[PDB]
Amino acid sequence: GPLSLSVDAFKIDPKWEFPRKNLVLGKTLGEGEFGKVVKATAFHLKGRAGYTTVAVKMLKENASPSELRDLLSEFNVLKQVNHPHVIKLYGACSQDGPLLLIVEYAKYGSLRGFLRESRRALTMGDLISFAWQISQGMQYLAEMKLVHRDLAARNILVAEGRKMKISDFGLSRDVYEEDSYVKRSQGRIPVKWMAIESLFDHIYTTQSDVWSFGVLLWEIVTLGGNPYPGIPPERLFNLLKTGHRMERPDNCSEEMYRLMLQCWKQEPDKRPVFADISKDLEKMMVKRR
Amino acid sequence: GPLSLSVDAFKIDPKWEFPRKNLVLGKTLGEGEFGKVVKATAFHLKGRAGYTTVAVKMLKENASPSELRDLLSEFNVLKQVNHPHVIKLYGACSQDGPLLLIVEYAKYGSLRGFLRESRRALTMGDLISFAWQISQGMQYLAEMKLVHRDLAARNILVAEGRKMKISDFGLSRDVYEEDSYVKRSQGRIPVKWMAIESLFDHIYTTQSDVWSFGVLLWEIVTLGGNPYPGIPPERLFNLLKTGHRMERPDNCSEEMYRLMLQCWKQEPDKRPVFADISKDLEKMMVKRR
Ligand SMILES: Cc1cc(Nc2cc(-c3cnn(CCN(C)C)c3)nc(Nc3ccc(CC(=O)Nc4cccc(F)c4)cc3)n2)[nH]n1
Ligand SMILES: Cc1cc(Nc2cc(-c3cnn(CCN(C)C)c3)nc(Nc3ccc(CC(=O)Nc4cccc(F)c4)cc3)n2)[nH]n1
């Protein structure tokens, strides 16, 4: 079937193969979508003499076919994209042991954990700078005809210099032909981040990510808050279609909240595009000086 | 879409509704397939005066549509089956809070944890008695035209008197019409427990469960061992089709190992049925006396 053909295709791309003897695994940083993330160090990686610190994405115990397929999908997307605000890929280990992906290591970890451990001194301007970088990256992925589908604070990484990096591409899909990706079965993205049409019609486009980007903005202004607090995920069906959205979060400007509301418009065509979301954030920072 | 129609259908079955004020949640026993399992106590449950200890299956934080659909599926199967070796359902809480399923509590927990914490004095006969009960239960589910699809040691519960209970019905499906369930997308069952045709053709029948029952027998004789030890799950594709199986585990009889091999025959029709798997286990115990 489909997965057995992909796996065999892998065992056959030398520019990405890395010897296993030069890889040393370390502590478990956390549990990913299709497995576990591990801190490691690589010797003579990509012509970089000496050891280099890196992160390894691998399958955990009792991996299912969907998790294996998701690991192969992320490897196929990362080796195509290149942008300062998207996690960089270095290689993979496919022979003489389990399947490993070698990616960039981010000092400060995920954006959610970085924010929940702050009040760290962070101003409103730095919060706007973070969102701007994320829009610069999503603007680049959309131009490559890709839908992330799982855009949230936990899927963003914070590297040296507080530079955002979009990560976790396991659920990403290509949409060059139809401009949309449709899933017949039930998806595996958290409900509270999904667009209304994605939740009801299983349609995923570049405008569905705009919805998720509005929830991500809500997470940032609330410094790692949980969306729709105190609402069972099974109730969002009747709440969203009736026209209800999250209320004004404290420590938020009327312009920031208005930008969120526009990302949550029922009609996808009425929602803004990433190119315009950047201009809005851009002017929100030049005025507060 | 499909899930939004099921959820609305739920909010409309009084014989299973239980008031929330009579439910008191406790410690987290563990993390389930679609969420978390919690130890609780229910007041005046099913005409049983006083408090009764129970287990609650609920959605965890950031639940996805697939996890919600799986919670609704288990609720639909459990309210149809009734057998001494299948977990019993008591009710559910659907109004005035999150979605909860109230099921039977098993003193000793899962069969895997029960075995890994033993050497507890367990003989070969008691190991045969455990497998026999599990076959009695699967024989009853097959007669109801149901495929469990996720039969393993962690999905079995051990109750008072060391009586087995088949649990975790989230991935179970009905097969009354076609006698088989086919999944177009990639499944979510651990590879090392899947039948070869399930892994390649995405076909699930009552004979696919026999394959999984043979791996479960391997877990029991090895007292909670991990199948195919030291083999990446992505390699099972080429290993299974080439005709390789797990080797003779120590502390195992030639008849017990031969029963396993028959559950692993490539041709599903050549594999035995549960009615015959019981007779084999039955005579394996009357002779060792
Ligand atoms: C892949 C990668 C990781 C990194 N770097 C780091 C650094 C740190 C870190 C924390 N503290 N300190 C040092 C501070 N100390 C001293 C207090 C460093 N932590 C992490 N954890 C970590 C971050 C992201 C994920 C992926 C993920 O969540 N997937 C997922 C999960 C669930 C659902 C879903 F949809 C997707 C996994 C784990 N990662 N770079 N590249
Ligand atoms: C639902 C239910 C639970 C129970 N009773 C108990 C009792 C105990 C227990 C342990 N020790 N002691 C007392 C001994 N002390 C003193 C040392 C009691 N533990 C558990 N844990 C527990 C058992 C099963 C699951 C479901 C599951 O794993 N789903 C899953 C997960 C991953 C993948 C997948 F495909 C499926 C979750 C958690 N459950 N009855 N009914």
Q: How many angstroms is it from B91 CA to the middle of ligand 1?
A: 39
**Which of A8, A13, A70, A150 is an active site residue?**
A150
A37 in a labelled binding site: yes
Strand boundaries in B137-260, DSSP class E: 146-147, 156-159, 163-166, 173-174, 181-182, 203-204
Maximum separation of any 2 CA atoms in chain A, in Å: 59
Tell me whether residue A39 is annotated as binding. no
Residues with Cβ within 8 Å of residue A288, at least 6 apart in sequence: A124, A125
Q: Which residues line ligand 2 (CB under 6 A)?
A: B 29-30, 32-33, 37, 55, 57, 103, 105-106, 109-110, 150, 154-155, 157, 167-168
Task: Name every chain A residue with its beta carbon within 8 A of the beta carbon of B186.
Answer: 2-3, 64-66, 68-69
**Across the interface, which of B66, B99, B186 has its CB nearest the CB of A186?**
B66
Instruction: For chain A, list the strands marked E by DSSP.
Output: 23-31, 36-45, 48-58, 89-93, 100-103, 109-110, 146-147, 156-159, 163-166, 173-174, 181-182, 203-204
Nearest CA among A210, A200, A192 for reference residue A261: A210
d(CA A174, CA A78): 12
Would residue B209 show up in a list of annotated catalytic residues for this protein?
A: no
**Among the partner residues B4, B68, B194, nearest to A200 by beta-carbon distance:** B4
Tokens 């004789």: give the residue.
Answer: B221
Q: What is the CATH T-level fold of the domain B106-286, as seen in this structure?
A: Transferase(Phosphotransferase); domain 1 (1.10.510)
CA distance B30 to chain A (A): 16
Confirm whether residue A282 is marked as ligand binding.
Answer: no
* A125 is an annotated ligand-binding site residue: no
Ligand 2, atom 17: closest residue by C-alpha:
B108
A42 is in an annotated binding site: no
Q: Is A165 in the pocket of ligand 1 (CB under 6 A)?
A: no
Q: How many CB atoms lie within 10 A of CB B176?
A: 8
> Could you tell me if A61 lies within 8 Å of chain B, comparing CB atoms?
yes
Residues of B in contact with A234 (CB under 8 A): 7, 59, 68, 98-99
Helices and strands: H and E segment counts in chain A: 9, 12
> Is B66–A191 a contact, with Cβ atoms under 8 angstroms apart?
no
Residue A55 in contact with ligand 1 by CB distance below 6 A? yes
Angle formed at CA A130 by CA A126 and CA A131, multiple of 5 degrees: 120
- Give distance in angstroms: CA of A58 to centre of ligand 1: 13
Length of chain A: 289
Taking the Cβ of residue B201 and every Cβ of chain A, the question of whether any pair is shorter than 8 Å is answered with yes
Are A187 and B63 inside 8 Å of each other by CB? no
Q: What residue segments make up the domains of chain B, in order of their start?
A: 8-105, 106-286
Ligand nearest to the CA of B38: 2
Check: CB of residue A167 under 8 Å from CB of residue A37.
Answer: no
The alpha carbon of residue B133 and the mean position of all alpha carbons in its chain are separated, in whole angstroms, by: 13
> What's the CA gap between B212 and B200, in Å, rounded?
15
Question: Which of the 8 DSSP states describes residue B211?
Answer: H
Quote the longest CA-to-CA distance of chain B: 59
Name residue, tokens 């996890």.
Answer: B67
Beta strands in B66-115 (DSSP E): 89-93, 100-103, 109-110
What is the rounded CA–CA span in Å between residue B49 and residue B51?
A: 7
How far apart are alpha carbons B114 and B76 in whole angstroms? 28
Bridge partners (DSSP) listed for residue A70: none
Instruction: Say whether B182 sits in a helix, a strand or coil.
Output: strand
The partner residue sitting opposite B190, judged by closest CB among A62, A200, A202, is A62
For chains A and B, count residue pairs whose Cβ atoms are closer than 8 Å.
102
What is A8-105's CATH number?
3.30.200.20
Task: Judge contact between A54 and A104, C-beta under 8 A.
Answer: yes
- Chain B closest CA to A39's CA: distance in Å? 20
Min Cα–Cα distance to chain B from A189, Å: 5
Which residues 6+ apart lie within 8 Å of A241 measured at CB?
Answer: A196, A200
Contact A50, A94 (CB under 8 A): no
Q: Of B148, B3, B146, B151, which is closest to residue B67 (Cα–Cα)?
A: B3
A34 is known to lie in a ligand binding site: yes
Q: Which two tokens stand for residue B175?
A: 């097969």
Cα-only R_g, chain A: 20
Q: Do B201 and A1 touch (CB under 8 A)?
A: yes
Closest-CA residue of chain B to A63? B190
Question: Is the Cβ atom of A149 under 6 angstroms away from ligand 1?
Answer: no
Backbone dihedral angles phi then psi of residue A118, each to the nearest 5 degrees = -145, -175
Helix (H) or strand (E) holding B236: helix B236-241
Q: How many residues are there in chain B? A: 289
Pocket test for ligand 2, best of B90, B110, B150 (most atoms within 8 A of CB): B110
Amino acid letter, A229? P
Sequence-ordered list of residues with C-beta below 8 angstroms from that of B143, at least 6 positions apart, any chain: none
By CB neighbour count within 10 A (0-12 exposed, 13-18 middle, 19+ buried), where does B148 fall?
buried
Q: What is the resolution of this structure in A?
A: 2.4
Give the contacts of A170 (CB within 8 A, at least 6 positions apart).
A32, A33, A34, A70, A71, A73, A74, A150
CA of A175 to the centre of ligand 1 (A): 28
Residues of B in contact with A229 (CB under 8 A): none
- The HSE-up count of residue A161 (CA atoms within 13 Å, CB side) is 6
For residue B105, the ligand 2 atom closest to its alpha carbon is 40
Q: Does B199 touch chain A (CB under 8 A)?
A: yes
Q: Using the beta-carbon criterion (under 8 Å), do B62 and A199 form an inter-chain contact? A: no
CA B191, chain centre distance (Å): 15
What gap in Å lies between CA B264 and CA B103, rounded to an integer? 33
Smallest Cα distance from B285 to chain A, Å: 32
